[PDB]
Design a protein around this ligand. Structure first.
Ligand SMILES: Cc1ccnc(SC(F)(F)c2nc3ccccc3o2)n1
Ligand SMILES: [Ca+2]
Lengths: 410, 557
């Protein structure tokens, strides 16, 4: 009992070839951390040095497990994921449970270390190639490929899925109401227990995993507390021509989304051609309108539903003062979820936190990460994002430079 | 020799067999040169005779190349190359000299017959078969295949580099203090050893490379003191760019100006303050290539100031990892920025310039932040860390813009430095509507069939005006309508538009635009004491906007 288990055949999508994505330059301390991490993995058999007959490449990054704790390597398998995942998620998809988001508490537990127990199919291995670069291009670049299931690859939980099922079975039998969802390198574990017993149950579940190659794994989300009630109408709203004019812009925007928003009675009142600072000689059939609009903005959006065949997209706006707003939709402005992220410094740091929080919510709710429209220059995002990133996944993103007064409506 | 190094396994692409391209008949002179070349190669083991069984052939020929009146063998590997797998990389980045650290001595060793010194896979050798044809192809040819990397084959560059890396590793492990840089055929070797102990270490490196089948037929460690590489001159203690005679001509063709600008752009990585915008203006709208373009006056100023900078030689220093990098940036014209990087004041490791392009409308605070990002990425690549910046912008200017602006940013540590001109914001929009200022409800419409337009306003004071407009568009009429309001208003004004586009443009506080209408607008905003701009949706029957919509559209559409 000290030799290999058996390999699952892995095919790349039909007619596609492996990824060949440029390694980004890294800082000296990040390079040194990766060379030390990779010397250890190579000593343990996880990865092997490769020669020039492998032309594939996936980027790698160093991040922190916490705050200056230890370093962790993060492989950006976004391209290999796409090239394996028009055809995976279908051959070996993990279904997502709708009761997860209804739990009082959900803990996220990292189980990625378990994947390194399982051999990767010899013929797929070349596609996992990556490079530790040198500073100033002084030295070619250290090259390796994986021998075991790698952590950021969507094929790893797909393949480990039969082992995970066996591992989890006695615990799920003993606790039939606990919802457990696996996405990438993490488990999401939800229950309605009070917070101390929730934690005692997570400790128990950690013991299970420990027997199978995990070392004391791991939080706490409270998704039954996740809110709608975004778009807000002021209370000193009906006083100036300007206030009423801003008001009507926010309502016009909102009537694109929500059936039943009005504003007719508000526009009357603006009747003439007035100084922006003038106070107003109505508010009556207008007060009633304003109240009904406020009632509909409390409730979910009547005709918009998730379509599992479509991408989620997330937009985020910088509100100032460490506040950020966001919306998630599949078709522009049919919002499935809106929210806020706030500290009370940086900007790039708050932004990478917002992104990670929105992605985590999205995994809980739909089993999918969103593609982000990020309000930032690309180069600036590319330089700085790993300084603050702590998650094991990386969503798709795009960079967005325009911002209509969408900021104001939210 | 042929290295004892292990071979790299190579394959053809999926579902492809090797090449079978027919040898063309060659002149008798070329046959005879090829017979002699291949005899010598075969004796060295470079190549082996093979049977007519091996199918596969790739054409060969010979010529006089790099004046080769001895004669040179060429193989046309186009077909095999199409059929061979892709390999790593190839080479995708060179160092910048400003990233190197100072050395006492450096030497270059050129590896003789580099590719022919490395064994080829062997399961793959059959696919490199070629034929020296008979006179008139009348009788069977003399057939060979390669045992070593061939000169024009797709895999030779990366297999060679991989082999060199493996061969150097045990030498570098025993000599952790020597720096080696591999560039094609060459090896650059730097140390902090005394001239005699360095010379011994080189002889050691040459005997180690000899053990692995690589000769450095450059006896006693060849090439002379200032090394030429990739357009630089390298010394062990400083570096520069290599030449730059700017011609002395009355007539400059487009070809000469393109060339001049390339040389100036190249010198600008060490000669501070180089400028090419005005020379660049001369290249507007390619007037051919042999056409003379008279130098404008701003172009003539520019070339004069450049020659002056190129006056005496300037060298960069090398990098000391114990010290911070300091980057300084100066505003140096209109689109134009210039920077210098140093660790001890004034001794630049390198210089550069940045002439931003990011949108049709921008401002100096945005552009400076962009220069800073470009410099940041550069430093990470070159030195593996970020520099501390010195910027010509007050801390309060920068933080007011970035805290109010809708995009995220962040930059390394930085300080203000007073090197005029300073970056500032040339006007600021009010946050709240202005008590006692006239309110202008502006609106524009164009037809789209006729391109006939109108732009005007109605005010809370009953003032009103429309002006006809001609080869315009919806977006232009909104802009002209705002400009008209600014022209006709006093020093304080509230403007109510229904154009997101215009508002979007003006809210970002541009100081510069590629639209002339927009630069006109900016001049006006600068003269104003206060402007509040507000937006309302079209055709909602909102008072004021209602009325202007009705008179700008009775004509328009
Ligand atoms: C010329 C110089 C100055 C300071 N240190 C060095 S180290 C090196 F010689 F290996 C070396 N030679 C190179 C040639 C081009 C690029 C990098 C090099 O490194 N070299
Ligand atoms: Ca308009």
């Amino acid at each position: 009992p000290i030799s290999p288990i058996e390999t699952v055949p892995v095919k790349l999508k039909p007619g596609m070839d492996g990824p060949k994505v440029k390694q980004w330059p890294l800082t000296e301390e990040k390079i040194k951390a990766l060379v030390e991490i990779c010397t250890e993995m190579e000593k343990e058999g996880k990865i092997s040095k490769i020669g020039p007959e492998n032309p594939y490449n996936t980027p790698v990054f160093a991040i922190k497990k916490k705050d200056s704790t230890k370093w962790r390597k993060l492989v950006d398998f976004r391209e290999l994921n796409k090239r394996t995942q028009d055809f995976w998620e279908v051959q070996l998809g993990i279904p997502h449970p709708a009761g997860l988001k209804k739990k009082k508490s959900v803990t996220v537990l990292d189980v990625g270390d378990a994947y390194f127990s399982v051999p990767l199919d010899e013929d797929f291995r070349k596609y996992t190639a990556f490079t530790i670069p040198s500073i100033n291009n002084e030295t070619p670049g250290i090259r390796y490929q994986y021998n075991v299931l790698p952590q950021g690859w969507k094929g790893s939980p797909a393949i480990f899925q039969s082992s995970m099922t066996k591992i989890l079975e006695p615990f799920k039998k003993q606790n039939p109401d606990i919802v457990i969802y696996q996405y990438m390198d993490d488990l999401y574990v939800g229950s309605d227990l009070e917070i101390g017993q929730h934690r005692t149950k997570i400790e128990e579940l950690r013991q299970h995993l420990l027997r199978w190659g995990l070392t004391t794994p791991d939080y706490e989300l409270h998704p039954d507390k996740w809110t709608v009630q975004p778009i807000v109408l002021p209370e000193k709203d009906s006083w100036t021509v300007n206030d009423i004019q801003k008001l009507v812009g926010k309502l016009n925007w909102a009537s694109q989304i929500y059936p039943g928003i009005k504003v007719r009675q508000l526009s009357k009142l603006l009747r003439g051609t007035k100084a922006l600072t003038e106070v107003i000689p109505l508010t009556e059939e207008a007060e009633l309108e304003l109240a009904e609009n406020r009632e509909i903005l409390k409730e979910p959006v009547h005709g918009v539903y998730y379509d599992p065949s479509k991408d989620l997209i997330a937009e985020i706006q910088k509100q100032g003062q460490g506040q950020w707003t966001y919306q998630i939709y599949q078709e522009p402005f049919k919002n499935l979820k809106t929210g806020k992220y706030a500290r009370m410094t940086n900007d790039v740091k708050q932004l990478t936190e917002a992104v990670q929080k929105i992605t985590t919510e999205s995994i809980v709710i739909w089993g999918k990460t969103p593609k982000f429209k990020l309000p930032i220059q690309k180069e600036t995002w590319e330089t700085w994002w790993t300084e603050y990133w702590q998650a094991t996944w990386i969503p798709e993103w795009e960079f967005v430079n325009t911002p209509p007064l969408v900021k104001l409506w939210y | 020799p042929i290295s004892p190094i292990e071979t790299v396994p190579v394959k053809l692409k999926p579902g492809m067999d090797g090449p079978k391209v027919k040898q063309w008949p060659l002149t008798e002179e070329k046959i005879k040169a090829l017979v002699e070349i291949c005899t010598e190669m075969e004796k060295e083991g470079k190549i082996s005779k093979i049977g007519p069984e091996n199918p596969y052939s790739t054409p060969v020929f010979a010529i006089k190349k790099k004046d080769s009146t001895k004669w040179r063998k060429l193989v046309d590997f186009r077909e095999l190359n199409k059929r061979t797998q892709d390999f790593w990389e190839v080479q995708l980045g060179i160092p910048h000299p400003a990233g190197l650290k100072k050395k006492k001595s450096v030497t270059v060793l050129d590896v003789g017959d580099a590719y022919f010194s490395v064994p080829l896979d062997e399961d793959f050798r059959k696919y490199t078969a070629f034929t020296i044809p008979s006179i008139n192809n009348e009788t069977p040819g003399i057939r060979y295949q390669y045992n070593v990397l061939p000169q024009g084959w797709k895999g030779s560059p990366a297999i060679f580099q991989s082999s060199m890396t493996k061969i150097l590793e045990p030498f570098k492990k025993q000599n952790p203090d020597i720096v080696i840089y591999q560039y094609m055929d060459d090896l650059y070797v730097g140390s902090d050893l005394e001239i005699g102990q360095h010379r011994t270490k080189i002889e050691e490196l040459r005997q180690h490379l000899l053990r692995w089948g690589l000769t450095t037929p450059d006896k006693k460690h060849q090439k002379e003191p200032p090394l030429l590489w990739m357009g630089y001159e390298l010394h062990p203690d400083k570096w520069t760019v290599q030449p730059i005679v700017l011609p002395e001509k009355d007539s400059w063709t487009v070809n000469d100006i393109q060339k001049l600008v390339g040389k100036l752009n190249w010198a600008s990585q060490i000669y501070p303050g180089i400028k090419v915008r005005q020379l660049c203006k001369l290249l507007r709208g390619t007037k051919a290539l042999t056409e003379v373009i008279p130098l404008t006056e701003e172009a003539e100023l520019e070339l004069a100031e450049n020659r002056e900078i190129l006056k005496e030689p300037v060298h960069g220093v090398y990098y000391d990892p114990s010290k911070d990098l300091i980057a300084e940036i100066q505003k140096q014209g209109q689109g134009q920025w210039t920077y210098q990087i140093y660790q001890e004041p004034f001794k630049n490791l390198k210089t550069g310039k940045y002439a931003r392009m990011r949108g049709a409308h921008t401002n100096d605070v945005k552009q400076l932040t962009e220069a800073v990002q470009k410099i940041t990425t550069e430093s990470i690549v070159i030195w593996g860390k970020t520099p501390k910046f010195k910027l010509p912008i007050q801390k309060e200017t920068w933080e007011t813009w970035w805290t109010e602006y809708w995009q995220a940013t962040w930059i390394p540590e930085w300080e203000f430095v007073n090197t005029p001109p300073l970056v500032k914001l040339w006007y600021q929009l009010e946050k709240e509507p202005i008590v006692g200022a006239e309110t202008f409800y502006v609106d524009g419409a164009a037809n789209r069939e006729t391109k006939l337009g109108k732009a005007g306003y109605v005010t809370n004071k009953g003032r009103q005006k429309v002006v006809p407009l001609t080869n315009t568009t919806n977006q232009k009429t909104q802009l002209q309508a705002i400009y008209l309001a600014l022209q006709d208003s006093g020093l304080e004004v509230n403007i109510v538009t229904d154009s997101q586009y215009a508002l979007g443009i003006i809210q970002a506080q541009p100081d510069k635009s590629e639209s002339e209408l927009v630069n006109q607008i900016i001049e006006q905003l600068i003269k104003k004491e206060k402007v509040y701009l507000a937006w309302v949706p079209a055709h909602k029957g909102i008072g004021g906007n209602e009325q202007v919509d009705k008179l700008v559209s009775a004509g328009i559409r």
